[PDB]
């Protein structure tokens, strides 16, 4: 019961094998991210992976 969760909440960015945003940013009313590029394979944890 306790926890308070989520949303309808599915928002993808462009998709594709995806990518990782080093930094997602927040500033008034308009917040967003940059992505360097695409980490490889389908699924990779960038900070640990490559």
Coordinates of N, CA, C and O in Angstrom, one line a residue:
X1 N 0.8 -1.2 0.0 CA 0.0 0.0 0.0 C 0.9 1.3 0.0 O 0.5 2.3 -0.6
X2 N 2.0 1.2 0.7 CA 2.7 2.4 1.1 C 3.1 3.3 -0.1 O 2.6 4.4 -0.2
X3 N 3.9 2.7 -1.0 CA 4.6 3.5 -1.9 C 3.7 4.2 -2.9 O 2.5 3.8 -3.1
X4 N 4.2 5.2 -3.5 CA 3.5 6.2 -4.4 C 4.3 6.3 -5.7 O 5.4 6.8 -5.7
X5 N 3.8 5.8 -6.8 CA 4.6 5.3 -7.8 C 4.2 5.8 -9.2 O 3.1 5.8 -9.6
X6 N 5.3 6.2 -10.0 CA 5.2 6.1 -11.4 C 4.1 7.1 -11.9 O 3.9 8.1 -11.4
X7 N 3.4 6.6 -13.0 CA 2.5 7.5 -13.8 C 1.9 6.5 -14.8 O 2.2 5.3 -14.7
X8 N 1.1 7.0 -15.8 CA 1.0 6.2 -17.0 C 2.4 5.9 -17.5 O 2.8 4.8 -17.8
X9 N 3.3 7.0 -17.6 CA 4.7 6.9 -17.6 C 5.3 5.9 -18.5 O 5.9 4.9 -18.0
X10 N 5.2 6.1 -19.8 CA 6.2 5.6 -20.7 C 6.5 6.7 -21.7 O 5.7 7.0 -22.6
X11 N 7.7 7.2 -21.6 CA 8.2 8.2 -22.5 C 9.6 7.7 -23.0 O 10.5 7.8 -22.2
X12 N 9.6 7.3 -24.2 CA 10.9 7.1 -24.9 C 11.4 8.3 -25.5 O 10.6 9.2 -26.0
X13 N 12.7 8.5 -25.6 CA 13.4 9.4 -26.5 C 13.4 8.6 -27.8 O 12.7 7.6 -28.0
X14 N 14.2 9.0 -28.8 CA 14.2 8.6 -30.2 C 14.2 7.0 -30.3 O 13.9 6.5 -31.3
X15 N 14.5 6.3 -29.2 CA 14.5 4.9 -29.3 C 15.8 4.3 -29.8 O 16.9 4.7 -29.4
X16 N 15.7 3.3 -30.7 CA 16.8 2.7 -31.4 C 17.5 1.9 -30.4 O 17.0 1.8 -29.3
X17 N 18.7 1.2 -30.7 CA 19.4 0.4 -29.6 C 19.5 1.2 -28.3 O 20.1 0.8 -27.3
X18 N 19.1 2.4 -28.5 CA 19.1 3.5 -27.5 C 20.5 4.1 -27.3 O 21.3 4.1 -28.3
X19 N 20.8 4.4 -26.1 CA 21.8 5.4 -25.9 C 21.9 5.7 -24.4 O 21.0 5.2 -23.7
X20 N 22.8 6.5 -24.0 CA 22.8 7.0 -22.6 C 23.0 8.5 -22.6 O 23.9 9.0 -23.3
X21 N 22.2 9.2 -21.8 CA 22.4 10.6 -21.6 C 23.4 10.7 -20.4 O 23.1 10.3 -19.3
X22 N 24.6 11.2 -20.7 CA 25.5 11.5 -19.6 C 24.7 12.3 -18.6 O 24.5 11.9 -17.5
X23 N 24.3 13.5 -19.0 CA 23.6 14.4 -18.2 C 22.2 14.7 -18.8 O 22.1 15.2 -19.9
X24 N 21.2 14.4 -18.0 CA 19.9 15.0 -18.2 C 19.7 16.3 -17.4 O 20.1 16.3 -16.2
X25 N 19.2 17.4 -17.9 CA 19.2 18.6 -17.2 C 17.8 19.1 -16.9 O 16.8 18.6 -17.4
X26 N 17.8 19.9 -15.9 CA 16.6 20.5 -15.4 C 16.7 22.0 -15.2 O 17.7 22.4 -14.5
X27 N 15.8 22.7 -15.8 CA 15.7 24.2 -15.5 C 14.3 24.5 -15.8 O 13.5 23.8 -16.3
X28 N 13.9 25.7 -15.3 CA 12.5 26.0 -15.2 C 11.7 25.7 -16.4 O 12.0 26.2 -17.5
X29 N 10.6 24.9 -16.2 CA 9.6 24.7 -17.2 C 10.1 23.9 -18.3 O 9.3 23.2 -19.1
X30 N 11.4 23.8 -18.5 CA 12.0 23.2 -19.7 C 13.2 22.4 -19.2 O 14.2 23.0 -18.8
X31 N 13.2 21.1 -19.3 CA 14.2 20.3 -18.8 C 14.4 19.2 -19.8 O 13.5 18.8 -20.6
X32 N 15.7 18.7 -19.9 CA 15.9 17.8 -21.0 C 17.3 17.2 -20.8 O 17.9 17.3 -19.7
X33 N 17.8 16.5 -21.8 CA 19.1 15.8 -21.8 C 19.8 16.0 -23.1 O 19.2 16.4 -24.1
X34 N 21.1 15.6 -23.1 CA 21.9 15.3 -24.2 C 22.3 13.9 -24.2 O 22.4 13.3 -23.1
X35 N 22.6 13.3 -25.3 CA 23.2 12.0 -25.3 C 24.4 12.1 -26.1 O 24.5 12.7 -27.2
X36 N 25.5 11.4 -25.6 CA 26.8 11.4 -26.4 C 26.6 10.6 -27.7 O 27.0 11.0 -28.8
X37 N 25.9 9.5 -27.6 CA 25.9 8.5 -28.7 C 25.2 7.3 -28.2 O 24.4 7.3 -27.2
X38 N 25.5 6.2 -28.9 CA 24.8 4.9 -28.6 C 25.8 3.9 -27.9 O 26.8 3.6 -28.6
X39 N 25.5 3.6 -26.7 CA 26.2 2.4 -26.1 C 25.9 1.2 -27.0 O 24.8 1.1 -27.6
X40 N 26.8 0.2 -27.0 CA 26.6 -0.8 -28.0 C 25.6 -1.8 -27.5 O 24.9 -1.6 -26.6
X41 N 25.5 -2.9 -28.2 CA 24.6 -4.1 -28.2 C 23.2 -3.5 -28.1 O 22.8 -2.4 -28.5
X42 N 22.3 -4.3 -27.5 CA 20.9 -3.9 -27.1 C 21.0 -3.2 -25.7 O 20.4 -2.1 -25.5
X43 N 21.7 -3.8 -24.8 CA 21.5 -3.5 -23.4 C 22.9 -3.5 -22.8 O 23.6 -4.5 -22.7
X44 N 23.3 -2.3 -22.3 CA 24.6 -2.2 -21.7 C 24.5 -1.1 -20.6 O 23.9 0.0 -20.8
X45 N 25.1 -1.4 -19.5 CA 25.1 -0.4 -18.4 C 26.3 0.5 -18.7 O 27.5 0.1 -18.3
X46 N 26.2 1.7 -19.2 CA 27.3 2.5 -19.6 C 28.3 2.8 -18.6 O 29.5 2.5 -18.8
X47 N 27.9 3.3 -17.4 CA 28.8 3.7 -16.4 C 29.8 2.6 -16.0 O 31.0 2.8 -15.8
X48 N 29.3 1.3 -15.9 CA 30.2 0.2 -15.9 C 30.6 -0.2 -17.3 O 31.8 -0.7 -17.4
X49 N 29.8 -0.1 -18.3 CA 30.1 -0.8 -19.6 C 30.6 0.2 -20.6 O 29.8 1.0 -21.2
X50 N 31.9 0.2 -20.9 CA 32.5 0.4 -22.2 C 32.0 1.7 -22.8 O 32.0 2.7 -22.1

